[PDB]
Design a protein around this ligand. Structure first.
Ligand SMILES: Nc1nc(NCCN2CCC(c3ccccc3)CC2)nc2nc(-c3ccco3)nn12
Ligand SMILES: CC(C)CCC[C@@H](C)[C@H]1CC[C@H]2[C@@H]3CC=C4C[C@@H](O)CC[C@]4(C)[C@H]3CC[C@]12C
Ligand SMILES: CC(C)CCC[C@@H](C)[C@H]1CC[C@H]2[C@@H]3CC=C4C[C@@H](O)CC[C@]4(C)[C@H]3CC[C@]12C
Ligand SMILES: CC(C)CCC[C@@H](C)[C@H]1CC[C@H]2[C@@H]3CC=C4C[C@@H](O)CC[C@]4(C)[C@H]3CC[C@]12C
Ligand SMILES: CC(C)CCC[C@@H](C)[C@H]1CC[C@H]2[C@@H]3CC=C4C[C@@H](O)CC[C@]4(C)[C@H]3CC[C@]12C
Ligand SMILES: CCCCCCCC/C=C/CCCCCCCC(=O)OC[C@@H](O)CO
Ligand SMILES: CCCCCCCC/C=C\CCCCCCCC(=O)OC[C@@H](O)CO
Ligand SMILES: CCCCCCCC/C=C\CCCCCCCC(=O)OC[C@@H](O)CO
Ligand SMILES: CCCCCCCC/C=C\CCCCCCCC(=O)OC[C@@H](O)CO
Ligand SMILES: CCCCCCCC/C=C\CCCCCCCC(=O)OC[C@@H](O)CO
Ligand SMILES: CCCCCCCC/C=C\CCCCCCCC(=O)OC[C@@H](O)CO
Ligand SMILES: CCCCCCCC/C=C\CCCCCCCC(=O)OC[C@@H](O)CO
Ligand SMILES: CCCCCCCC/C=C\CCCCCCCC(=O)OC[C@H](O)CO
Ligand SMILES: CCCCCCCC/C=C\CCCCCCCC(=O)O
Ligand SMILES: CCCCCCCC/C=C\CCCCCCCC(=O)O
Ligand SMILES: CCCCCCCC/C=C\CCCCCCCC(=O)O
Ligand SMILES: CCCCCCCC/C=C\CCCCCCCC(=O)O
Ligand SMILES: CCCCCCCC/C=C\CCCCCCCC(=O)O
Ligand SMILES: CCCCCCCC/C=C\CCCCCCCC(=O)O
Ligand SMILES: CCCCCCCC/C=C\CCCCCCCC(=O)O
Ligand SMILES: CCCCCCCC/C=C\CCCCCCCC(=O)O
Ligand SMILES: CCCCCCCC/C=C\CCCCCCCC(=O)O
Ligand SMILES: CCCCCCCC/C=C\CCCCCCCC(=O)O
Ligand SMILES: CCCCCCCC/C=C\CCCCCCCC(=O)O
Ligand SMILES: CCCCCCCC/C=C\CCCCCCCC(=O)O
Ligand SMILES: CCCCCCCC/C=C\CCCCCCCC(=O)O
Ligand SMILES: CCCCCCCC/C=C\CCCCCCCC(=O)O
Ligand code: NA
Length: 392
């Protein structure tokens, strides 16, 4: 009619989809290759990273070819059409499970580092990954379980396209119910987990900030109470300061040169405490001055290393949170459009070109994670360089 031949816009959409598919495959194969090759990348966190890269490889290999297919409106048995339409929901759900697992993994690592290695193992991670893939199929293919529009085929459209008996024009919104897409897929299965992830990341950053402040508080307490002892004028004041220092030292103690340093510190505090209890103020103060040598030669090195470890965990959690935020940024437009279609039947449907933009944007998310790893994680970046240099 008055509209341009459909193959022209179709050709642009399909070409862009194929470009995205190539890049999603290439980048995420590289991710999987790096983890396979580099033992420094083989940890539980990165097993979920690989599960996420696998979902993104399958966006390129399967979901994008399926999206290209369903954009034609080809004649199909309705339940086969549903599979074509819904398989991408499986991969998105799997991604959400991987993203949530990564957040939780980093929370356990910062909140209870002493039991992380005993609690979060590779064997348990592989079990969780398998369970999450099964649940992703069940959630994303729930329309194949009967929550579909196949009982109400658009017969006039099927007839105009010459479809056979029992077939429909395979179009996403004709077969997939929008109440499923909004209430079940978006609200329950996407939005709630993303808000949960946000809460987990808030807890991670709050715990890091609290632990860093506790490190500096213990350091300040050590130096303040040293001054208190130096300008004390009786044995009772030295004793009070040393008793608070001994509790802090044990509290900071909670590796061989680390343990020797705290062993020295507590012993030296005990030395001065014994002199103080005998009422020997000058001798107690001189004994407490020895603590400065231990503080410079050991304690300050522990403080710097503890701080450095925490800042690396903050940096790693920020990298993970960026990937979760980019998943939300890339998928929200499509979900929001579905909300308008569903909740505002008096509003004109979002136009075809905008839907395809939103679909392309969702698919582009399967391209971006390898770049975040390359730019933010040195161990990935260096391994990528080795693979590319040695093999391309
Ligand atoms: N909703 C939706 N559609 C499609 N494809 C059909 C596009 N067609 C939808 C109708 C539109 C139209 C415009 C003006 C007048 C009538 C009709 C044309 C354009 N694919 C999807 N994927 C996800 C999706 C996956 C995860 C969350 O949402 N929603 N969705
Ligand atoms: C392991 C991988 C590579 C295999 C991929 C198999 C895919 C391509 C197969 C599995 C099930 C198939 C669908 C099953 C039924 C129908 C209904 C029919 O009227 C049109 C084709 C259609 C829509 C098929 C398209 C192709 C399909 C999606
Ligand atoms: C054994 C594994 C590896 C195969 C992968 C399973 C998927 C891709 C295939 C296997 C069998 C397929 C189904 C076989 C037959 C039909 C009946 C038709 O009316 C609609 C499609 C539908 C419902 C297919 C949907 C997709 C399907 C579930
Ligand atoms: C997730 C972040 C980036 C926000 C994205 C907001 C996008 C998805 C929003 C902002 C403005 C919105 C549009 C505002 C008005 C209309 C006209 C109505 O007849 C159909 C929906 C439609 C076309 C909306 C679709 C969704 C929309 C494009
Ligand atoms: C934390 C944030 C990102 C959650 C996402 C917010 C979503 C659920 C919000 C943002 C804008 C909202 C839409 C804004 C306007 C309208 C038009 C109205 O006639 C029906 C509801 C509808 C369609 C809203 C539905 C819900 C909506 C899509
Ligand atoms: C149409 C059907 C298409 C096929 C869909 C199949 C989707 C299932 C894909 C699953 C990919 C999962 C890969 C994820 C692999 C993660 C690595 C791992 O778990 O190893 C850790 C342990 O070994 C350490 O002890
Ligand atoms: C289907 C899409 C492609 C999926 C590919 C998944 C391949 C994952 C391969 C990369 C993970 C290998 C691994 O983690 O081994 C760890 C063990 O050595 C424990 O130390
Ligand atoms: C490689 C290229 C494979 C893509 C081949 C897909 C061809 C479908 C097409 O272009 O027409 C349908 C649209 O006009 C919808 O109206
Ligand atoms: C593996 C990667 C392959 C992806 C291809 C996606 C499936 C391609 C879907 C086939 C289209 C079709 O069946 O048309 C004929 C019908 O109209 C019968 O009436
Ligand atoms: C291993 C990789 C396997 C790759 C298999 C290739 C799949 C390409 C699927 C696209 C080919 C499927 C579309 C062919 C078709 O539907 O034409 C006839 C109809 O138009 C008449 O109604
Ligand atoms: C955060 C979660 C946000 C949920 C927002 C859902 C609100 C959507 C509620 C829309 C109800 C409505 O549109 O009724 C219209 C009728 O008058 C018929 O046109
Ligand atoms: C967390 C997100 C949870 C959100 C709960 C919001 C419930 C919103 C419930 C709105 C019900 C409605 O009026 O739907 C009308 C449609 O049928 C179209 O007319
Ligand atoms: C926990 C997750 C475990 C996964 C369990 C799945 C049950 C298998 C259900 C098999 C569904 C077959 C449905 C079907 O073939 O037809 C349905 C109907 O025709 C549509 O309208
Ligand atoms: C990311 C790359 C940005 C490029 C954006 C171009 C992609 C899609 C908009 C093209 C308009 C055609 C819509 C689809 C028409 C159809 O399905 O037949
Ligand atoms: C590179 C992508 C290849 C170009 C594909 C164009 C599609 C042709 C068509 O729609 O008929
Ligand atoms: C996005 C694209 C990243 C491209 C990476 C190019 C080299 C990867 C080669 C490969 O391992 O398959
Ligand atoms: C389409 C699916 C493509 C997925 C590719 C993922 C690549 C990553 C790991 C595959 C396992 C490695 C197999 C050969 C190993 C060779 C060796 O270690 O010497
Ligand atoms: C690495 C393996 C990747 C798989 C390659 C497949 C790429 C082909 C892309 C899209 C499939 C085209 C489907 C055409 C729909 C039929 C149109 C119609 O019947 O009207
Ligand atoms: C292996 C990669 C797939 C190989 C070739 C892709 C060719 C797909 C041709 C689609 C035909 C579309 C049509 O006939 O309507
Ligand atoms: C829910 C569907 C359940 C599927 C069974 C998955 C098999 C993996 C079990 C391993 C459990 C684990 O080690 O944590
Ligand atoms: C709903 C039943 C269909 C289940 C098929 C998909 C499950 C794939 C199984 C394991 C995913 C990879 C295991 C990780 C090691
Ligand atoms: C739960 C996982 C899959 C259920 C859907 C299987 C295909 C149903 C059509 C026959
Ligand atoms: C569509 C919603 C899914 C419905 C709920 C399904 C219930 C599955 C829940 C948890 C799985 C727990 C893992 C148990 C592993 C058992 C392994 C074994 O028996 O050998
Ligand atoms: C719904 C939107 C929420 C999506 C964001 C999810 C994770 C990023 C966390 C931000 C860190 C604070
Ligand atoms: C809805 C977002 C959920 C908020 C989660 C609580 C965060 C608690 C905190 O760390 O301060
Ligand atoms: C540039 C990318 C598009 C950005 C925003 C789209 C906002 C409104 C889209 C057009 C509405 C079409 C209509 O309802 O008539
Ligand atoms: C064809 C459009 C593909 C665009 C993908 C953009 C994502 C890559 C990230 C940084 C460059
Ligand atoms: Na993904």
């Amino acid at each position: 009619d008055d509209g341009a031949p459909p193959i022209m816009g179709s050709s642009v959409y399909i070409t862009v989809e194929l470009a995205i598919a190539v890049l999603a495959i290439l980048g995420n194969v590289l991710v999987c290759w790096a983890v396979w090759l580099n033992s420094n990348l083989q940890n539980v966190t990165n097993y979920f990273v690989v599960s996420l890269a696998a979902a993104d490889i399958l966006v390129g290999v399967l979901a994008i070819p399926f999206a290209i297919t369903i954009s034609t409106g080809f004649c199909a048995a309705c339940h086969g059409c549903l599979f074509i339409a819904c398989f991408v929901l499986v991969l998105a759900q799997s991604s959400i499970f991987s993203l949530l697992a990564i957040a939780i993994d980093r929370y356990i690592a910062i909140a209870i580092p002493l039991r992380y290695n005993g609690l979060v193992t590779g064997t348990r991670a592989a079990g969780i990954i398998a369970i999450c893939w099964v649940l992703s199929f069940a959630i994303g293919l729930t329309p194949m379980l009967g929550w579909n529009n196949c009982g109400q085929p658009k017969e006039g459209k099927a007839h105009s396209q010459g479809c056979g008996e029992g077939q429909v024009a395979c179009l996403f919104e004709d077969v997939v119910p929008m109440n499923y897409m909004v209430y079940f897929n978006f609200f329950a299965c996407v939005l709630v987990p993303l808000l949960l992830m946000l809460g987990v990341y808030l807890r991670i950053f709050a715990a890091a900030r609290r632990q860093l402040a506790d490190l500096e508080d213990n350091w300040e307490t050590l130096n303040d109470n040293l001054k208190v002892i130096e300008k004390a004028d009786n044995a009772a004041q030295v004793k009070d300061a040393l008793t608070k220092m001994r509790a802090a030292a044990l509290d900071a103690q909670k590796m061989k040169d680390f343990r020797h340093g705290f062993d020295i510190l507590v012993g030296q505090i005990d030395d001065a405490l014994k002199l103080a209890n005998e009422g020997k103020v000058k001798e107690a103060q001189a004994a407490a001055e020895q603590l400065k040598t231990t503080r410079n030669a050991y304690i300050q090195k522990y403080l710097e290393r503890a701080r450095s470890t925490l800042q690396k965990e903050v940096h790693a959690a920020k990298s993970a949170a960026i990937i979760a935020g980019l998943f939300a940024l890339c998928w929200l437009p499509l979900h929001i459009i579905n909300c308008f279609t569903f909740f505002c039947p008096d509003c004109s449907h979002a136009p075809l070109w905008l839907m395809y933009l939103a679909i392309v944007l969702a698919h582009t998310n399967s391209v971006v994670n390898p770049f975040i790893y390359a730019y933010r994680i040195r161990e990935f970046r260096q391994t990528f360089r080795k693979i590319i240099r040695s093999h391309v």
